Ligand SMILES: NC(=O)C1=CN([C@@H]2O[C@H](COP(=O)(O)OP(=O)(O)OC[C@H]3O[C@@H](n4cnc5c(N)ncnc54)[C@H](O)[C@@H]3O)[C@@H](O)[C@H]2O)C=CC1
Ligand SMILES: NC(=O)C1=CN([C@@H]2O[C@H](COP(=O)(O)OP(=O)(O)OC[C@H]3O[C@@H](n4cnc5c(N)ncnc54)[C@H](O)[C@@H]3O)[C@@H](O)[C@H]2O)C=CC1
Ligand SMILES: O=CNC1CCCCC1
Ligand SMILES: O=CNC1CCCCC1
Ligand SMILES: [Zn+2]
Ligand SMILES: [Zn+2]
């Protein structure tokens with residue numbers, strides 16, 4: 001009874017940086033050709049959503065943020081072939097158009113249809129499906145999941161198993177897949193290796209899960225919040241270090257601990273200094289360091305290229321290197337077959353209406369992932 | 375004759391930075407345990423030797439530089455098992471001890487016995503075998519080939535084919551192997567790919583050779599000296615560009631030419647700005663950039679880590695990633711089997727006494743490799 005009609009529903013609108021979200025009514029247009037309107041069931045609070053609030057991640061405001069989520073298709077536009085009304089789906093913050101040079105490449109996943117490099121805050125057609133107080137509101141990464149309903153381009157949604165528990169598998173839409181793939185796909189962690197993981201939030205814990213799945217012998221968690229260490233050990237860290245406890249820079253500490261440098265290191269925070277420290281602590285001739293964290297907008301790091309000339313490899317990735325539409329259904333199937341766990345990442349559950357409390361929990365250091373239910 | 379005795383011979387001593395080499399008599403001590411004394415036959419002029427003169431590369435002075443060479447063993451110290459008097463040999467500016475964690479790793483080659491990371495300018499035992507006018511003179515990279523005789527540690531020398539032409543295969547001791555391996559081993563250039571090579575000297579031409587051997591479809595040479603372009607095309611470049619001819623930054627030019635970025639780029643100059651430009655010109659989701667050039671001492675580059683977060687891989691390497699003692703004899707055997715050519719790199723051949731003239735040729739832009747003959 002809503003197909004083809006505007007839907008009025010609640011969403012969390014961000015009108016200004018550094019302010020609480022405003023939970024209020026929005027109007028959601030029906031889907032145009034090759035678009036899908038989704039009734040949201042659950043969405044996680046990822047640090048990247050907070051980066052929009054703080055100005056770390058710049059995208060046009062006002063905006064409906066949220067990108068790690070799962071829901072049920074309410075209606076489809078003309079020409080949609082990959083999902084149908086009633087299907088369970090995960091929106092894809094990195095799309096998979098299937099047609100660009102990146103989608104066609106065996107390794108690449110950062111589809112050229114993304115809205116990250118040159119943010120417009122729109123659908124693929126350059127327009128918005130959201131109105132609030134009569135004003136157009138921007139989308140975020142082609143997802144915008146902090147709303148009871150959203151509209152996404154078909155290349156930004158994947159159909160998943162009809163029996164999936166949406167309050168858990170929403171994490172496959174960003175944080176779990178990112179960390180897990182960063183270890184198993186991007187770094188390609190090897191059996192018996194030593195790994196160092198900087199940042200023990202939801203994404204860093206998922207990196208640990210992937211390093212353990214790959215058979216690493218040592219997994220050193222690094223965080224300035226020692227309250228993060230117990231869960232890190234539960235999911236596979238063999239030891240944890242707090243840089244604030246040491247008189248020496250932690251790259252020196254980690255080099256000593258690993259008898260000359262780690263095999264694989266991961267920056268899962270989003271600071272320029274820890275990106276350079278993480279590179280430095282891998283072994284100078286054969287180490288690999290992967291940047292996962294988001295840097296503050298437009299800022300450059302400084303580093304000595306002799307760190308690379310000796311033989312290190314430095315890389316980064318979005319979404320764990322996974323081609324998003326191909327990979328998300330398979331990761332859900334693997335979760336349903338118990339191949340990895342999501343419960344360790346979920347520390348808090350709240351209704352959507354308590355979104356601001358959910359962001360308070362993240363900012364205070366108390367949560368890993370808070371899941372919001374609609 | 376000479377075995378077990380001090381040898382007085384001619385060498386090129388660098389007494390201080392930014393001065394001509396001084397060609398004069400030096401005394402070369404006999405080899406101690408596990409050392410090898412070599413009569414030099416030919417040595418190439420690599421830009422890294424010039425970096426010692428200019429202060430770009432810091433190593434203790436006064437010094438006998440030179441590291442790209444070939445000669446004949448004159449005598450061996452106690453315990454040497456891998457070469458014998460009369461053998462043709464290439465000194466190894468990166469050693470291969472066979473016992474450190476890097477030598478044991480399948481990928482690594484930057485053996486921990488190297489004299490690059492913390493230059494001492496000595497033999498492995500911390501002492502020098504050279505005296506000149508009664509003063510001790512430093513070694514360079516455990517090689518020191520600008521002398522009629524040198525003494526090296528066993529781990530810094532490889533025995534090669536007795537029929538090898540030393541006036542050509544000296545280049546396998548540094549510049550050829552570095553550039554070729556940077557393409558075929560470090561980057562692992564793929565068939566049909568597009569490559570960009572910054573710097574068209576001896577090392578960058580060897581990168582082009584390797585890209586062509588790997589089957590690249592397009593190889594774009596980049597140099598500010600257009601006189602380098604004809605030879606670059608002879609060895610495989612499909613086009614060449616001079617940044618000075620363009621109003622736009624060359625990274626933008628190369629991105630446009632390659633319809634969104636190259637597959638592989640190589641910095642083969644030694645400038646911070648070209649290291650960042652070369653990274654930027656590879657495709658943002660799956661491109662690979664390899665640093666080969668030597669940065670000026672103690673200087674840091676500045677770069678935006680979003681270049682990596684999208685999916686690029688940045689790496690560097692010494693000596694093309696080759697494990698030096700294993701690889702040098704095989705590369706000579708490959709040369710003798712006609713698997714690659716060295717003549718395109720050799721533009722001038724001069725007697726050793728004309729070393730300063732050979733450096734003037736390099737500095738003026740007029741040579742690729744000058745081979746000095748003893
Ligand atoms: N590449 C990608 O596709 C994705 C990137 N991200 C980014 O990954 C990063 C991590 O995200 P979450 O795990 O959700 O964030 P989080 O905020 O839950 O975790 C970050 C952790 O870093 C620790 N930390 C902060 N400063 C530190 C320092 N100086 N040294 C050591 N530890 C420090 C914190 O105590 C915290 O436990 C964020 O920048 C986020 O934007 C997130 C998802 C996808
Ligand atoms: N990684 C390693 O193992 C090795 C590194 N090297 C380093 O590789 C670099 C290249 O060495 P060679 O080929 O012997 O040097 P070279 O001096 O013969 O070649 C350098 C080329 O760069 C060009 N160039 C200079 N400035 C430029 C700019 N701004 N833009 C574009 N082109 C520019 C020059 O015109 C020249 O053709 C040097 O820094 C050298 O020290 C050399 C041997 C081994
Ligand atoms: O968290 C989801 N996506 C992130 C990916 C890294 C850049 C900022 C957006
Ligand atoms: O040219 C030979 N070796 C080079 C290797 C890169 C650092 C400077 C010295
Ligand atoms: Zn695409
Ligand atoms: Zn996220």
Ligand SMILES: [Zn+2]
Nearest residue numbers: 471474477485
């Ligand atoms: Zn070694």
Ligand SMILES: [Zn+2]
Nearest residue numbers: 420422548549
């Ligand atoms: Zn050299």
